[PDB]
Amino acid sequence: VRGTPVRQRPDLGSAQKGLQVDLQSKLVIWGTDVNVAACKENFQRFLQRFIDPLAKEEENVGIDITEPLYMQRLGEINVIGEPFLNVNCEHIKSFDKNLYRQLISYPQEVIPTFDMAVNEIFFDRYPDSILEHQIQVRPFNALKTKNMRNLNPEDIDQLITISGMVIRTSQLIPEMQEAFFQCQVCAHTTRVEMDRGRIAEPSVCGRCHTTHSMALIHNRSLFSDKQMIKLQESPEDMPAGQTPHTVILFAHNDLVDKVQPGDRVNVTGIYRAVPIRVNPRVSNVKSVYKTHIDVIHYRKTDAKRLHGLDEEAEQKLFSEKRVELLKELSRKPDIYERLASALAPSIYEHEDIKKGILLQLFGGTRKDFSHTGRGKFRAEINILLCGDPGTSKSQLLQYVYNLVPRGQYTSGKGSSAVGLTAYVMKDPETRQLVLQTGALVLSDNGICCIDEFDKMNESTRSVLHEVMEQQTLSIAKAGIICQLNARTSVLAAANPIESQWNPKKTTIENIQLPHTLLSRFDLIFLLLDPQDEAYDRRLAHHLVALYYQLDMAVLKDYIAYAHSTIMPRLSEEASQALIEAYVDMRKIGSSRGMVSAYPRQLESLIRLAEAHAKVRLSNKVEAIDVEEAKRLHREALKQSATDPRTGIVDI
């Protein structure tokens, strides 16, 4: 302590009695097995000398041999102003297993001890540092609770980690922390802090001794931020017949507005049980309590996903060694093919679909057309997979769904128009009507996978027009009028009319989608079945070999680096290549029953070329990028196998 303010922690709840009990007729807290002194000293021992002996990557500061991992973090807290220490509970588990057991079991008593220990260590050195408040420790990565339905009343008030997707976040709620009073008579003022969740009103002023003359003045009081979050849990254990679960989270002061709807997050917090009133206007409570998490920490990183937008925007996400390795990869002649092949490794030789999906994961160049009157340009790549069944479209959509952050999966008739855009429900915790987003807004900066695109009625497929053209969702409903953001990539899979490609019908007759809607997709991959025996044999071997027996982290970091730093711009010779390509492709597609080209396919080419240049870490779009855009656009739609009169045959 340096006289630095020790701000209260609403995430730990209201303080308890904190009675000290001696177990001899040593001085544990009543009902616990922790004494504050030994817990504090254990944690200091942990902070001073803990080294991860197995982890060397993604530190960017961590010397990871230097005796503290965490006092390096304290040094960072000195360099930056933020007074928060995120302690990985697995580290505590390694160092002191009993301390870990105590932490997850009595967090409300152990975490404040951790706070005192951290501030003692920090202000031992850095004794002239200035912090807007003392350091607050945030333990994360506790032993993951796989299914939150498995939690018992034995687990109430313990520290748990869960994962799921943020569904709704409330508006910020002001929570009182210190009340302000004035006497209506003498104008003498006093302040009263929250004590166990209530304020004791002064009831006599100490100046003019008038009974009940001090009045609470709300806007001179001190408040804290609170936010309710609906999180749809993503359990790793899914017992038979169990429906999906929504858990209430409450974030406080600084974790408020830290996650947006559609974000996948690991949340560490305290499992709380709270009483329900029988009416809002009485004080009787039910015998059966309801539960929520008081959020302690948000972890956005996931090993199996790509980096989220919050991570990619973080300046120190890569070490210099990592950036050099990524750039060295970008100099490889076939980095495009390597990265494409790293996608869906269990799917057999759909190399062009995988290249298109890679370009979709990279995306085109975000542009600010705001001074041009034009509007907003869609930098997202929309792919449609049309092909006869059994050709692994749903597997590709499932792979992309399970790989990106901010993704959604929709199939067929299970979605409606208002279920994709937005609707009003009544929050059953506030008794208030709140607006909930649908699938197309929850993937606002991600990929929406629409499966069985064709088996999906035109009512809900009209919603896609504005999303795919203008990246916005204008809703003019009864009272609420706004323009939701829907900057999604669309990965759609559909069957032909008659559910199987028949060769007697032209491509347009056989896809059978409105011809204005097909122009919104910038790749239409025709996943057709050649009646080919060699391919049968090779696929059969892949599939059977699948019944007995490039990295991801590098792919993840490569894509994150490309999104962070690379903003490809068209070169003059790329400009000319695009002009010629559009004119040629428009000549080609003007044939009988082929998918025609509109001025929108020129922008499709631009997006694909920019994405491909971004794969090279190029920062400059060149003729090779436009050439690959043309080639990908032609290979999808099988325009080499298409005659200008009729359908296609086989490759």
């Binding site: 009695k17 009675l19 000290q20 009990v21 009543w30």
Partner: protein, 140 residues
């Protein structure tokens, strides 16, 4: 299920300038248990402990407390009794009930319920005039 109601239960108060009345009552209990009269030559006896024992076993349920004994053992308690007799005599009598309980324990059946003890009190101070009972002496 919505028919019965059990009681409200509580525990002993395990854990935890102007002393609270519980503490004053405890000091009164200590005074009654531990106020010793006599000398090691003639022996020591605990005056009020065995007086409570004798009176209770006879069925008396009262004791006589000298205010100088209390003043010597605990001068603050005697000051409380003089200034605010009403509440501190309630404390002292409750203390006497407890001490009598723990010196007659156990009691023959029929005498199972513990009795209230009246604490009469005396002093050696010279009496004041009945004419001196002015208004400043009210509630003392």
């Amino acid at each position: 299920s919505g028919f019965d109601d059990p009681g409200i239960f509580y525990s002993d108060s395990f854990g935890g300038g102007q002393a609270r009345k519980s503490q004053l009552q405890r000091r009164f209990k200590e005074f009654l248990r531990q106020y010793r009269v006599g000398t090691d030559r003639t022996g020591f006896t605990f005056k009020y402990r065995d007086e409570l024992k004798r009176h209770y076993n006879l069925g008396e349920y009262w004791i006589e407390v000298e205010m100088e004994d209390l003043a010597s053992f605990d001068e603050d308690l005697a000051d409380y009794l003089y200034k605010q007799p009403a509440e501190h005599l309630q404390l002292l009598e409750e203390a006497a009930k407890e001490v009598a309980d723990e010196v007659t324990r156990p009691r023959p059946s029929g005498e199972e319920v513990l009795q209230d003890i009246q604490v009469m009190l005396k002093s050696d101070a010279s009496p004041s005039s009945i004419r001196s009972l002015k208004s400043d002496m009210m509630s003392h």
